[PDB]
mmCIF file with all atom_site columns, C-alpha atoms in Angstrom:
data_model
loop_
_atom_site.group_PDB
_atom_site.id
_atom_site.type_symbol
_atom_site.label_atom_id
_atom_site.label_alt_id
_atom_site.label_comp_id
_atom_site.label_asym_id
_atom_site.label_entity_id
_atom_site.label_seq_id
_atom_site.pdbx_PDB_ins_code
_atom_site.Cartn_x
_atom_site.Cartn_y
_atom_site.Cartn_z
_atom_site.occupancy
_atom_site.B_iso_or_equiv
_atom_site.pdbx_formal_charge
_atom_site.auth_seq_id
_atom_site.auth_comp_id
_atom_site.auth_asym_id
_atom_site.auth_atom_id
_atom_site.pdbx_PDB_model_num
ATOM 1  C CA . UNK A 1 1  ? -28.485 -1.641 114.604 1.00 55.73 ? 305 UNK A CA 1
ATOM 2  C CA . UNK A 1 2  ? -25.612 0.695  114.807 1.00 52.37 ? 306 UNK A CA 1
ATOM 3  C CA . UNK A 1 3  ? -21.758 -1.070 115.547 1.00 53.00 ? 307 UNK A CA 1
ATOM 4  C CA . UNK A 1 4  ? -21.405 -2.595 112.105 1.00 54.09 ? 308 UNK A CA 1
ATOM 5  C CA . UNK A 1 5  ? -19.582 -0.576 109.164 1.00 55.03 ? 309 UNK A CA 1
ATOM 6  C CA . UNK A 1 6  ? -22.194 1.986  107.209 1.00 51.50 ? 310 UNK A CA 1
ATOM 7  C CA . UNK A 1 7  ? -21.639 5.285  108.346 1.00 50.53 ? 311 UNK A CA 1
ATOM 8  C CA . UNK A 1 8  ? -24.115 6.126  110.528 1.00 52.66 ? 312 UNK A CA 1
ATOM 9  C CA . UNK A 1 9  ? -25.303 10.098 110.685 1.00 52.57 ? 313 UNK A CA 1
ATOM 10 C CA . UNK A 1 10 ? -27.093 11.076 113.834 1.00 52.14 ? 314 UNK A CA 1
ATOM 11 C CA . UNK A 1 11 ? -28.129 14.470 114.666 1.00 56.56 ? 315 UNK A CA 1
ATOM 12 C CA . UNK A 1 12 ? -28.136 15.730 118.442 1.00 56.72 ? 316 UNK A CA 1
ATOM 13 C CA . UNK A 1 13 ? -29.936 18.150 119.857 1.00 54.52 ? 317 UNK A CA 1
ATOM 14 C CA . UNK A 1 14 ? -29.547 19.629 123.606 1.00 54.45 ? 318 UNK A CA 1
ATOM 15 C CA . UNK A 1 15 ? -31.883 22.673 124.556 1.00 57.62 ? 319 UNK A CA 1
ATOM 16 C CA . UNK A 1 16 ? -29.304 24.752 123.787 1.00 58.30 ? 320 UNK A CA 1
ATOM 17 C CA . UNK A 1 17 ? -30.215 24.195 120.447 1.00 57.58 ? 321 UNK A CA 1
ATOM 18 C CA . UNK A 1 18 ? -26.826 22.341 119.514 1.00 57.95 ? 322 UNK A CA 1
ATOM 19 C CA . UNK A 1 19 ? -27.233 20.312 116.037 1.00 56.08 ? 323 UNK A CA 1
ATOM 20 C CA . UNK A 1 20 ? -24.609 17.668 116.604 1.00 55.29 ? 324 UNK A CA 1
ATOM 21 C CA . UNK A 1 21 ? -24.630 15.717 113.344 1.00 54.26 ? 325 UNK A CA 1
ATOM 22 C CA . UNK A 1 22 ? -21.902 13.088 113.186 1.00 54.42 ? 326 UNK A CA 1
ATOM 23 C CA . UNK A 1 23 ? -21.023 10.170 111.195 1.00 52.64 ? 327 UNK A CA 1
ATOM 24 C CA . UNK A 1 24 ? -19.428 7.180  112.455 1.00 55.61 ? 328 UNK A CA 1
ATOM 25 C CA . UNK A 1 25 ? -19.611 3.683  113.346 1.00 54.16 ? 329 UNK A CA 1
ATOM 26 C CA . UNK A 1 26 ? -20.663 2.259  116.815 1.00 56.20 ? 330 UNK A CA 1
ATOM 27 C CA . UNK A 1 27 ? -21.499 5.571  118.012 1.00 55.19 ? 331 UNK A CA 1
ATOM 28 C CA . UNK A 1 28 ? -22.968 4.238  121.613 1.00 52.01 ? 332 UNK A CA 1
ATOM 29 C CA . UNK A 1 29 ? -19.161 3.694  122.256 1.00 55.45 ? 333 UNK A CA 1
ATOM 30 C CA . UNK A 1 30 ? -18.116 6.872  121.131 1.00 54.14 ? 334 UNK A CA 1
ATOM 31 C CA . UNK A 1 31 ? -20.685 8.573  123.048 1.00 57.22 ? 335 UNK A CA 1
ATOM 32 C CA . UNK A 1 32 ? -20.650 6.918  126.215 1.00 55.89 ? 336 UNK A CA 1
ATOM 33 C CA . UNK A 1 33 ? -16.783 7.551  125.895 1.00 54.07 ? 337 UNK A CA 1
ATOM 34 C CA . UNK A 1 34 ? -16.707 11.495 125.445 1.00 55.36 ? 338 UNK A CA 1
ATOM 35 C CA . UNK A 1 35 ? -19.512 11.479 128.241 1.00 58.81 ? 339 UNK A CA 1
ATOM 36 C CA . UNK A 1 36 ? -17.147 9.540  130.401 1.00 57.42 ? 340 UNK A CA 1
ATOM 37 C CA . UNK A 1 37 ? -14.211 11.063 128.846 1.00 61.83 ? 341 UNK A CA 1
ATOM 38 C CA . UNK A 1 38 ? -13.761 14.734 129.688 1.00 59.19 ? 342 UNK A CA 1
ATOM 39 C CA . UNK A 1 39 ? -14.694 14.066 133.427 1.00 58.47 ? 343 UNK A CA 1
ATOM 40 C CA . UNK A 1 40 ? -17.508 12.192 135.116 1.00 60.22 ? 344 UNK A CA 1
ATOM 41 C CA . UNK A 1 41 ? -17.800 9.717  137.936 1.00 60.10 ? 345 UNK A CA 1
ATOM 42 C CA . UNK A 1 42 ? -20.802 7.613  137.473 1.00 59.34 ? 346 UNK A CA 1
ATOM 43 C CA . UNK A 1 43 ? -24.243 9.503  135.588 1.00 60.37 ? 347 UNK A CA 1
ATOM 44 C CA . UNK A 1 44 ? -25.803 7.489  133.057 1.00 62.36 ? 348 UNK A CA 1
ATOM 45 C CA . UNK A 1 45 ? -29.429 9.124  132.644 1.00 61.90 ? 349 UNK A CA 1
ATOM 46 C CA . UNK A 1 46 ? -27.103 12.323 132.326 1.00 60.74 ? 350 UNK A CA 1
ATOM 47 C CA . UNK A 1 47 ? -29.814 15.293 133.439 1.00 58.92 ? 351 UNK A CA 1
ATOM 48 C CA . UNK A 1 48 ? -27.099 18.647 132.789 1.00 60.11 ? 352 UNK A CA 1
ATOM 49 C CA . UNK A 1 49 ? -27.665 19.105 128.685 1.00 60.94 ? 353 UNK A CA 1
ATOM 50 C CA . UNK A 1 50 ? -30.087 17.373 127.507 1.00 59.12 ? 354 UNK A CA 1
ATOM 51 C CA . UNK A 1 51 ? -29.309 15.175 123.841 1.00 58.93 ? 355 UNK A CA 1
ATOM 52 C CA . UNK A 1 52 ? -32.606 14.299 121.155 1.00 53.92 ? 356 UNK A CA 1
ATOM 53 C CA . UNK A 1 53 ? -32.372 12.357 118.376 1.00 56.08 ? 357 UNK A CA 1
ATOM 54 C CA . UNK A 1 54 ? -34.202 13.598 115.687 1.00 54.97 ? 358 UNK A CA 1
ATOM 55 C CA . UNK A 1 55 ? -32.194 12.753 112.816 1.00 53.96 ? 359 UNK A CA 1
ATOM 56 C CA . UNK A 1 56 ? -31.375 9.071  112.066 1.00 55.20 ? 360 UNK A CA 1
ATOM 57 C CA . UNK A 1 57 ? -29.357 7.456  108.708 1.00 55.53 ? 361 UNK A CA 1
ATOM 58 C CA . UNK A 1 58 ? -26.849 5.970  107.984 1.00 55.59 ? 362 UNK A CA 1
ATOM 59 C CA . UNK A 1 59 ? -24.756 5.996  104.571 1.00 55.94 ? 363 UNK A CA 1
ATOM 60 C CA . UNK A 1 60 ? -22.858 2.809  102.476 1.00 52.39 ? 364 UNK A CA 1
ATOM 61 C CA . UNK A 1 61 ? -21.098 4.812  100.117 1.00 53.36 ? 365 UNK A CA 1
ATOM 62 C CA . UNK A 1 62 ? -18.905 7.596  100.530 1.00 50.52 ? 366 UNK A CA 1
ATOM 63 C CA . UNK A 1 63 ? -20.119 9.804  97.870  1.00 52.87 ? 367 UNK A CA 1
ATOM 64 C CA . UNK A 1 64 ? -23.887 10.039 99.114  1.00 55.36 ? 368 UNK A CA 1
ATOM 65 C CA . UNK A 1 65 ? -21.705 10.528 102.844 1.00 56.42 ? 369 UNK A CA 1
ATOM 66 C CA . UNK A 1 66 ? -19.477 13.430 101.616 1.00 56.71 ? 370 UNK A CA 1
ATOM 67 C CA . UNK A 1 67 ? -22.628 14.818 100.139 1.00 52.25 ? 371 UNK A CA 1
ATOM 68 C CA . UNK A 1 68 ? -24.701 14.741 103.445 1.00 50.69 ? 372 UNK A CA 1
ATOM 69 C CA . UNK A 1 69 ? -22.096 16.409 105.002 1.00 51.79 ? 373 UNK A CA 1
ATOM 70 C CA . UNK A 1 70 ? -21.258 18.848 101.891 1.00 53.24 ? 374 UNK A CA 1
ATOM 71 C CA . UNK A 1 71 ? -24.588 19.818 101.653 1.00 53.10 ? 375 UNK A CA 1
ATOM 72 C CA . UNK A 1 72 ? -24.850 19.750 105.806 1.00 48.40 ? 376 UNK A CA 1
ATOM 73 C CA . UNK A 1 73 ? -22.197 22.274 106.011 1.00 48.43 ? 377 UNK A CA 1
ATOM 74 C CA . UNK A 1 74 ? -24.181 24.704 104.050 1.00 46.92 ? 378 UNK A CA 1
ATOM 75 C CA . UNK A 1 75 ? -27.760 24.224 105.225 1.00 45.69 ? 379 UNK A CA 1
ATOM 76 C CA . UNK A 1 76 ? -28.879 24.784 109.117 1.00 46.12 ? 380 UNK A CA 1
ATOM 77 C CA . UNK A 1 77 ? -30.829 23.764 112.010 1.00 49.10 ? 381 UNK A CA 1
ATOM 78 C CA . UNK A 1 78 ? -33.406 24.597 109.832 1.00 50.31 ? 382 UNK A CA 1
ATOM 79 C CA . UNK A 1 79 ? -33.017 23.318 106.180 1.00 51.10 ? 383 UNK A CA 1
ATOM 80 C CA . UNK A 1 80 ? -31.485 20.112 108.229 1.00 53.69 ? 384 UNK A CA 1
ATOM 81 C CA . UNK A 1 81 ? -34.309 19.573 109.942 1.00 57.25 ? 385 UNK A CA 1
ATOM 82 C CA . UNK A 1 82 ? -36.786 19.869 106.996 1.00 60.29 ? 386 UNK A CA 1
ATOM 83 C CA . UNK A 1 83 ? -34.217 18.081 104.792 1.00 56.67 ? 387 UNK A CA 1
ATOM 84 C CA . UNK A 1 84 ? -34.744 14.801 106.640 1.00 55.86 ? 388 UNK A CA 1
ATOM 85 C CA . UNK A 1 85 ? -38.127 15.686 108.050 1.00 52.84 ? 389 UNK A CA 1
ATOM 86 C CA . UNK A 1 86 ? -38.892 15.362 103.759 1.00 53.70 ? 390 UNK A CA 1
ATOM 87 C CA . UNK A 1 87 ? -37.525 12.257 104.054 1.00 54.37 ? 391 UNK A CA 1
ATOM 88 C CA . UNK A 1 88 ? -38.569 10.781 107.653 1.00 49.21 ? 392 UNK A CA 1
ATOM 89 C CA . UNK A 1 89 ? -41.943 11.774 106.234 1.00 49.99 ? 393 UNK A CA 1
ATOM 90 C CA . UNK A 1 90 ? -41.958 9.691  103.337 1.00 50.13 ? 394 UNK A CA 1
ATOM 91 C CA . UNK A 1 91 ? -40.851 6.081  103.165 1.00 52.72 ? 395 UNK A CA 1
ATOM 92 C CA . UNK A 1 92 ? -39.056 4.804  100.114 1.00 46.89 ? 396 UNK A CA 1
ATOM 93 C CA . UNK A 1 93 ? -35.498 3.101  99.922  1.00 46.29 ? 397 UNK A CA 1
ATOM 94 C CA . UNK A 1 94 ? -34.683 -0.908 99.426  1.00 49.25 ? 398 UNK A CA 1
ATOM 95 C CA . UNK A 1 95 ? -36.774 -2.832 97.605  1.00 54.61 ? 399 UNK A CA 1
ATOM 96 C CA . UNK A 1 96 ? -39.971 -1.866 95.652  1.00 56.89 ? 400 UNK A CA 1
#
């Protein structure tokens, strides 16, 4: 779905406990890029530091966008997680 204006806001996580929460568009190109940017040969599945997604949205407007991040610069890996988990949860956007 991603690749296609709307910022998109995903959250990485490695097992070093690394919240990586970006937002961007066509992210699978900007991924696959820094992977195969700093150095690399030819390792797709990628092993070495591991990356979960368990954070996914994306934003239209900029406001609700400078407030994710606003608000994700103050809470943590913690308040983050819960702060979507409230809303993964739950299903209720679009429509009625």
């Amino acid at each position: 779905m991603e690749n296609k204006k709307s910022h998109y806001f995903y959250v990485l996580l490695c097992q070093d406990g690394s919240f990586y929460g970006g937002y961007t568009t066509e992210p699978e190109r900007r991924l696959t890029e820094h992977n195969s940017g700093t150095g690399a040969k030819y390792t797709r599945l990628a092993k070495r530091r591991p990356v979960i997604m368990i954070h996914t949205e994306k934003f239209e407007t900029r406001s609700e966008a400078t407030k994710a991040e606003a608000a994700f610069k103050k809470l943590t890996r913690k308040q983050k997680e819960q702060y979507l988990k409230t809303f993964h949860l739950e299903h209720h956007h679009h429509h009625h």
